[PDB]
Design an enzyme around this catalytic site. Structure first.
Site, PDB file in Angstrom:
ATOM      1  N   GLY A  20      21.679   8.612  -3.510  1.00 32.77           N
ATOM      2  CA  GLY A  20      22.197   8.985  -4.816  1.00 32.77           C
ATOM      3  C   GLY A  20      21.075   9.711  -5.543  1.00 32.77           C
ATOM      4  O   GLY A  20      21.222  10.849  -5.988  1.00 32.77           O
ATOM      5  N   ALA A  22      17.736  10.685  -4.463  1.00 26.41           N
ATOM      6  CA  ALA A  22      16.635  11.456  -3.924  1.00 26.41           C
ATOM      7  C   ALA A  22      16.985  12.312  -2.763  1.00 26.41           C
ATOM      8  O   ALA A  22      17.895  12.022  -1.988  1.00 26.41           O
ATOM      9  CB  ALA A  22      15.520  10.514  -3.528  1.00 26.41           C
ATOM     10  N   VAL A  24      15.142  13.537   0.696  1.00 19.31           N
ATOM     11  CA  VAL A  24      14.010  13.249   1.560  1.00 19.31           C
ATOM     12  C   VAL A  24      13.711  14.407   2.495  1.00 19.31           C
ATOM     13  O   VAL A  24      14.589  14.906   3.210  1.00 19.31           O
ATOM     14  CB  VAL A  24      14.187  11.935   2.358  1.00 19.31           C
ATOM     15  CG1 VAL A  24      12.898  11.577   3.083  1.00 19.31           C
ATOM     16  CG2 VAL A  24      14.554  10.802   1.407  1.00 19.31           C
ATOM     17  N   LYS A  39       9.840  11.743  -0.664  1.00 24.12           N
ATOM     18  CA  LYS A  39      10.966  11.414  -1.457  1.00 24.12           C
ATOM     19  C   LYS A  39      10.824  12.135  -2.771  1.00 24.12           C
ATOM     20  O   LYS A  39       9.899  11.853  -3.540  1.00 24.12           O
ATOM     21  CB  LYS A  39      10.990   9.941  -1.728  1.00 24.12           C
ATOM     22  CG  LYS A  39      12.386   9.373  -1.797  1.00 24.12           C
ATOM     23  CD  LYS A  39      12.292   7.927  -2.204  1.00 24.12           C
ATOM     24  CE  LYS A  39      13.495   7.512  -3.013  1.00 24.12           C
ATOM     25  NZ  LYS A  39      13.536   6.036  -3.189  1.00 24.12           N
ATOM     26  N   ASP A 131      18.806  -5.276  -1.549  1.00 23.47           N
ATOM     27  CA  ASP A 131      19.613  -4.222  -0.946  1.00 23.47           C
ATOM     28  C   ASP A 131      19.356  -4.131   0.533  1.00 23.47           C
ATOM     29  O   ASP A 131      19.097  -3.065   1.071  1.00 23.47           O
ATOM     30  CB  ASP A 131      19.360  -2.884  -1.631  1.00 23.47           C
ATOM     31  CG  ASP A 131      20.498  -1.911  -1.442  1.00 23.47           C
ATOM     32  OD1 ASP A 131      21.647  -2.336  -1.078  1.00 23.47           O
ATOM     33  OD2 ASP A 131      20.243  -0.702  -1.714  1.00 23.47           O
TER      34      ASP A 131
HETATM   35  C1  LIG Z   1      16.524  10.412   8.296  1.00 21.98           C
HETATM   36  C2  LIG Z   1      15.070  10.186   8.778  1.00 21.98           C
HETATM   37  O1  LIG Z   1      14.861  10.488   9.965  1.00 21.98           O
HETATM   38  C3  LIG Z   1      13.938   9.578   7.951  1.00 21.98           C
HETATM   39  C4  LIG Z   1      12.661   9.595   8.509  1.00 21.98           C
HETATM   40  N1  LIG Z   1      11.568   9.092   7.895  1.00 21.98           N
HETATM   41  C5  LIG Z   1      11.648   8.479   6.650  1.00 21.98           C
HETATM   42  C6  LIG Z   1      10.571   7.906   5.970  1.00 21.98           C
HETATM   43  C7  LIG Z   1      10.754   7.308   4.726  1.00 21.98           C
HETATM   44  C8  LIG Z   1      12.033   7.288   4.128  1.00 21.98           C
HETATM   45  C9  LIG Z   1      12.357   6.690   2.951  1.00 21.98           C
HETATM   46  C10 LIG Z   1      13.533   6.945   2.280  1.00 21.98           C
HETATM   47  C11 LIG Z   1      13.841   6.262   1.118  1.00 21.98           C
HETATM   48 CL1  LIG Z   1      15.292   6.645   0.247  1.00 21.98          CL
HETATM   49  C12 LIG Z   1      12.976   5.284   0.631  1.00 21.98           C
HETATM   50  O2  LIG Z   1      13.239   4.599  -0.506  1.00 21.98           O
HETATM   51  C13 LIG Z   1      11.816   4.996   1.302  1.00 21.98           C
HETATM   52 CL2  LIG Z   1      10.745   3.774   0.707  1.00 21.98          CL
HETATM   53  C14 LIG Z   1      11.523   5.681   2.461  1.00 21.98           C
HETATM   54  N2  LIG Z   1      13.005   7.813   4.854  1.00 21.98           N
HETATM   55  C15 LIG Z   1      12.849   8.413   6.045  1.00 21.98           C
HETATM   56  C16 LIG Z   1      13.998   8.966   6.654  1.00 21.98           C
HETATM   57  N3  LIG Z   1      15.156   8.635   5.679  1.00 21.98           N
HETATM   58  C17 LIG Z   1      16.506   9.322   5.401  1.00 21.98           C
HETATM   59  C18 LIG Z   1      16.834   9.990   4.132  1.00 21.98           C
HETATM   60  C19 LIG Z   1      17.953   9.315   3.393  1.00 21.98           C
HETATM   61  C20 LIG Z   1      17.726   7.818   3.153  1.00 21.98           C
HETATM   62  C21 LIG Z   1      19.231   7.573   3.016  1.00 21.98           C
HETATM   63  N4  LIG Z   1      19.916   6.516   2.038  1.00 21.98           N
HETATM   64  C22 LIG Z   1      19.029   6.255   0.814  1.00 21.98           C
HETATM   65  C23 LIG Z   1      20.513   5.356   2.604  1.00 21.98           C
HETATM   66  C24 LIG Z   1      17.202   7.191   4.402  1.00 21.98           C
HETATM   67  C25 LIG Z   1      17.346   8.101   5.594  1.00 21.98           C
END
Ligand SMILES: CC(=O)c1cnc2ccc(-c3cc(Cl)c(O)c(Cl)c3)nc2c1N[C@H]1CC[C@H](CN(C)C)CC1
Length: 313
Positions: A20, A22, A24, A39, A131
């Site tokens: 919602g 951010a 990434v 993020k 969560d």
């Molecule tokens: C997709 C992928 O390969 C990937 C690879 N490396 C990452 C490293 C850190 C974070 C990260 C994302 C959020 Cl929203 C956080 O709050 C934190 Cl602490 C870390 N995400 C990813 C990452 N995340 C993706 C981006 C969207 C997020 C999806 N929803 C919030 C459910 C999670 C999936």
């Protein structure tokens, strides 16, 4: 555009996901060459939810752990907030479960112990996640779980995973882990409905379908975790040495951090000092202020890189 201060330290690749709040983005830390996830959040779009961001950040700065996604750098500009994070190329646990349809009990248990390790550690620092669900659990390169998304952390969340006491904090995380455990082993939710009112009634009722392929042991654990009354629900303490959790393990769950920052790495500090034109002694004073600025990011990224190499030596 206020991206250009960030491009001092990183070069951005593609958007890897959204939420919602951010966007990434994959990025590369220029100095170390390490891949990272960034993020990006717009403060103006955040609007009245901005304090949740500052809760998320203060929480991530206080947690350091094998199964918790590491935060390297926090940058704030006029419009945006940037969080530079450990890159987890394996993606969500959610996608993995779906690719397998459901997980075997033996495999559920590998995953579940890592969840428990992270969650017990979060609690040992006085938080509750609030969560827990498999969208918030990511596999890093070694197929190890990392917990993410600390925006609802407390010192809320998806309804299907939400504890009944919460829909009207330690005990609640236990309920959600109970739901997680059902999904890993079954491939669907114990409470599901297109109608939120119908779903709400199912959660309070607490009755779910128990499939034929589950073990009696795991079934019992489920009912211990999926107690509607938090008072009757199993405590975290007893989860940690529960017989199902330990089946075929001489090790009950080691939730303690294997990665404290006890003291500073010489190779990393040396490398930093050369670039920074300062002595190792000066640089050691600097790093210990821990401001999650660029010096912090670079030290931690260098440490992460050293650790990786040392695993293939
Ligand atoms: C997709 C992928 O390969 C990937 C690879 N490396 C990452 C490293 C850190 C974070 C990260 C994302 C959020 Cl929203 C956080 O709050 C934190 Cl602490 C870390 N995400 C990813 C990452 N995340 C993706 C981006 C969207 C997020 C999806 N929803 C919030 C459910 C999670 C999936």
């Amino acid at each position: 555009k206020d991206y250009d201060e960030l491009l001092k330290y990183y070069e951005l690749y593609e958007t890897i996901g959204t939420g919602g709040f951010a966007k990434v983005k994959l990025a590369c830390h220029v100095l170390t060459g390490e891949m990272v996830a960034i993020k990006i959040m717009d403060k103006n779009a955040l609007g009245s939810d901005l304090p949740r961001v500052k809760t998320e950040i203060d929480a991530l700065k206080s947690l350091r752990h094998q199964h918790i996604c590491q935060l390297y750098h926090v940058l704030e500009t006029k419009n945006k907030i940037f969080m530079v994070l450990e890159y987890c190329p394996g993606g969500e646990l959610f996608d993995y479960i779906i690719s397998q349809d459901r997980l075997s009990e033996e495999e559920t248990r590998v995953v579940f112990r890592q969840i428990l390790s992270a969650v017990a550690y979060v609690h040992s620092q006085g938080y509750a996640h609030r969560d827990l669900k498999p969208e918030n659990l990511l596999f890093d390169e070694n197929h190890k779980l990392k917990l993410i998304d600390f925006g609802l952390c407390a010192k809320c969340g998806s309804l299907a995973y939400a504890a009944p006491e919460l829909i009207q904090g330690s005990e609640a995380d236990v309920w959600s882990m109970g739901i997680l455990l059902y999904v890993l082993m079954c491939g669907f939710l114990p409470f599901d409905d297109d109608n939120v009112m119908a779903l709400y009634k199912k959660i309070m009722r607490g009755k779910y379908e128990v499939p034929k392929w589950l073990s009696p042991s795991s079934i019992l654990l489920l009912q211990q975790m999926l107690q509607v009354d938090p008072k009757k629900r199993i405590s975290m303490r007893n989860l940690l040495n529960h017989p199902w959790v330990m089946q075929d393990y001489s090790c009950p769950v080691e939730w303690q951090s294997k990665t404290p920052l006890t003291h500073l790495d010489e190779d990393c500090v040396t490398e930093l000092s050369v670039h920074h034109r300062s002595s190792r002694q000066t640089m050691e004073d600097l790093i210990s202020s821990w401001q999650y600025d660029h010096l912090t990011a670079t030290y931690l990224l260098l440490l992460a890189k050293k650790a990786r190499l040392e695993h293939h030596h």
